[PDB]
Design a protein around this ligand. Structure first.
Ligand SMILES: CN(C)C(=O)Oc1cccc(N)c1
Ligand SMILES: CN(C)C(=O)Oc1cccc(N)c1
Lengths: 300, 237
């Protein structure tokens, strides 16, 4: 179990750690988060009390270094940093734990939620979507745009998700226009899975990361990406059976975890009704269809 | 964007454009089987592709053999239309290819767009106008090259005959749309207006009679009466 210490909390802020969140008052004696489970990526995220504008945060993996948070009064945000001096870090953490100035990552033992939301998400793939190679952790916020969004403006600050576009030469084989547009199996299995992602685990990892950025930061381009990746599978007549069974599990836990009051903006009515009721896989997402129908019957 | 009453003069500017109508591509007669069930028999159809500025009509005849052994024919018809339009554009010299293609039914947008991915600078547009292009197929000579076809065939016509020697393309299009609206709403009583007088004939190389300018005004007036009436006979007014 690892620790992310905070230098201080000079501004009132709601702090999130994965799916948990807590309020910290201006200048409250808060010095970080302990007992963070090893073996998973994590996200620590922030919303200032004075400016709910800009949710922002950092994706990290404590196996890749010792990381802490420090408020920057010039740029006006909580920044993640790496501490290269190992004995300095251990000494900092042990003092803060001794003075009980840290919150405990509050995982319930029966609870697999975070594992189920991040099963295929790897830090190395996050760092290729979010390019800032001098750091081991990745910054994301509500306003960052995606590569595909830029085509339709600062490249350094973009989310480099895999571009999916159903009306594109990559998606449509010359001479198979109707076939490839109505059955996207070619595009899913050959172009994306065999060609670009290499395997379905990398595909699911990007889908999961896109959902998490949509949910935690209200990142609109990430929501677009999540839905596009769902639609590409559902619109394929030919999908490996293990992929469909895993997709159903993935989506089920995403829908389970979604705030009930954010479903109006985070869920695209057209994609979901198509996927669950019109698509080739309309009968292949039993768990997802049952939770959607019992929790968001309005959308449908 | 969508083509409507507001931007109607754009049809007659000097940017090449084509209307594409797919109504008459997949055509059937519905009949009873010996067992008393219902079946369809397809008949020949056509794609109606019209340059509104010149009157250049590319009439691609769709022979019933193209449906043999195929499923979901109404859906296939839209993709077949898009494939043929795409093939037509690729056959034209660059300086004759359209800058816009306007489809008369919105269901043609995605099929044409996918077939034209190679042509990103050709705009595919819908329209809000209720254009009466199915109604060409009621002109006997048109009913006949389509029905007589024994194989796929492209037939080239000017749908305005020689009108552009005397009127503008705006006026020619308006005449065409009035005749076709007329030939829709009531084929029989609108068939009388054009040839119930035996001294006005069509040249061998034309679709409409050689009306003089004054006879066209009379004819056009008779067609508007027909359309207004039928709109009464229909709605009782
Ligand atoms: C064989 N004929 C004379 C023929 O096509 O009759 C029509 C019918 C309707 C409109 C026109 N223009 C001509
Ligand atoms: C390229 N096409 C549309 C074409 O030339 O159409 C015409 C025009 C005028 C007379 C004839 N016979 C055909």
């Amino acid at each position: 179990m690892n620790t992310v210490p905070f230098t201080s909390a000079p501004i009132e802020v709601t702090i999130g750690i994965d799916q948990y969140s807590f309020n910290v008052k201006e200048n409250q004696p808060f010095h970080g988060i302990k007992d963070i489970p090893i073996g998973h990526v994590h996200v620590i995220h922030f919303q200032h009390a004075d400016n709910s504008s800009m949710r922002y945060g950092y994706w990290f993996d404590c196996r890749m270094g010792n990381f802490y948070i420090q408020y920057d009064p010039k740029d006006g945000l909580y920044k993640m940093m790496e501490e290269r001096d190992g004995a300095k870090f251990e000494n900092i953490v042990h003092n803060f734990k001794e003075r009980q100035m840290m919150v405990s990552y509050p995982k319930i033992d029966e609870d697999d939620t975070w594992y189920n939301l991040t099963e295929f998400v790897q830090m190395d793939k996050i760092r290729k979507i979010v390019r800032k190679d001098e750091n081991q952790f990745s910054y994301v916020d509500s306003s960052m745009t995606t590569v595909q969004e830029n085509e339709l403006s600062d490249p350094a600050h973009s989310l480099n998700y895999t571009v999916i576009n159903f009306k594109s030469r990559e998606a449509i084989r010359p001479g198979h226009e109707m076939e490839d547009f109505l059955d996207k199996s070619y595009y899913l299995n050959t172009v994306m899975l065999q060609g670009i992602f290499k395997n379905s685990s990398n595909y699911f990892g990007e889908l999961q990361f896109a959902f998490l950025n949509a949910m935690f930061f209200g990142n609109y381009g990430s929501s677009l990406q999540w839905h596009a990746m769902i639609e590409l599978i559902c619109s394929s007549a030919t999908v490996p059976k293990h992929m469909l069974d895993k997709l159903d599990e993935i989506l089920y836990y995403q829908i389970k975890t979604l705030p009930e009051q954010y479903s109006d903006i985070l869920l695209n009515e057209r994609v979901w009704n198509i996927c669950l009721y019109s698509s080739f896989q309309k009968n292949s997402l039993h768990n997802t269809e049952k939770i959607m129908e019992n929790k968001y019957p309005e959308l449908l | 964007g969508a083509m409507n009453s507001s931007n109607y003069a754009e049809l007659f500017n000097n940017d090449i454009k084509l209307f594409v109508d797919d109504t008459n591509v997949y055509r059937v007669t519905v009949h009873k089987t010996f067992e008393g069930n219902v079946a369809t028999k397809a008949i020949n159809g056509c794609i109606f592709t019209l340059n509104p500025k010149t009157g250049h009509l590319f009439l691609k005849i769709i022979h019933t053999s193209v449906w043999a052994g195929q499923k979901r024919l109404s859906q296939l018809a839209k993709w077949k239309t898009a494939e043929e339009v795409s093939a037509l554009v690729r056959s034209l010299p660059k300086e004759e290819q359209p800058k816009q293609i306007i489809v008369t039914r919105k269901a043609m947008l995605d099929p044409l767009e996918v077939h034209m991915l190679d042509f990103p600078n050709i705009a595919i547009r819908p329209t809000e106008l209720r254009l009466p292009f199915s109604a060409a197929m009621s002109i006997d000579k048109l009913s006949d090259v389509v029905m007589k076809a024994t194989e796929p065939q492209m037939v080239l016509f000017n749908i305005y005959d020689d009108w552009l020697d005397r009127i503008s393309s705006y006026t020619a299009f308006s005449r065409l749309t009035l005749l076709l609206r007329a030939l829709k709403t009531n084929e029989e009583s609108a068939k009388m207006i054009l040839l119930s007088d035996p001294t006005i004939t069509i040249k061998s190389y034309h679709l409409w009679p050689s009306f003089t300018d004054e006879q066209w005004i009379t004819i056009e007036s008779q067609m508007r009466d027909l359309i207004l009436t039928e709109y009464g006979r229909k709605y009782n007014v």
